[PDB]
């Protein structure tokens, strides 16, 4: 239902907290200025796969990025406390105002690989889908 502009981040190690240092964590993309680098990572939790027989196979969480004012919690203000939401912003962004970046329309744009500014420390126990 909610299309992220970017590939997800999958947890592969239990017990590691999803987080970035303040100022870090917004995917970088051509065409998007630093002033629009504000948003949240949203946890797709309780994930499962139904095997051909009937093992309900549990999967670990995957997190997706949404620009501020878009996505599942498009109505939340930056910093609002919600389980499964982690807020991130570049220092040049005004987190008091919604993103000017429109929600992805899958019929017109595909998501792009998640990349970060060089020097961004990723949370341990997580890997970025699509490299």
UniProtKB/Swiss-Prot annotation:
> Which positions fall inside the CoV N NTD domain?
1-130
Determine the domain of life of the protein's source. Answer: Viruses
* Residues the entry annotates as binding RNA: 46, 62, 104
Q: Which cysteines are joined by disulfide bonds?
A: none
User: What is known about its subunit structure?
Assistant: Homooligomer. Both monomeric and oligomeric forms interact with RNA. Interacts with protein M. Interacts with NSP3; this interaction serves to tether the genome to the newly translated replicase-transcriptase complex at a very early stage of infection.
**Similarity comment:** Belongs to the betacoronavirus nucleocapsid protein family.
UniProt name for this protein:
Nucleoprotein
State the organism named in the record.
Murine coronavirus (strain A59)
Q: Which residues of the complete protein does this chain represent?
A: 64 to 194 of 454
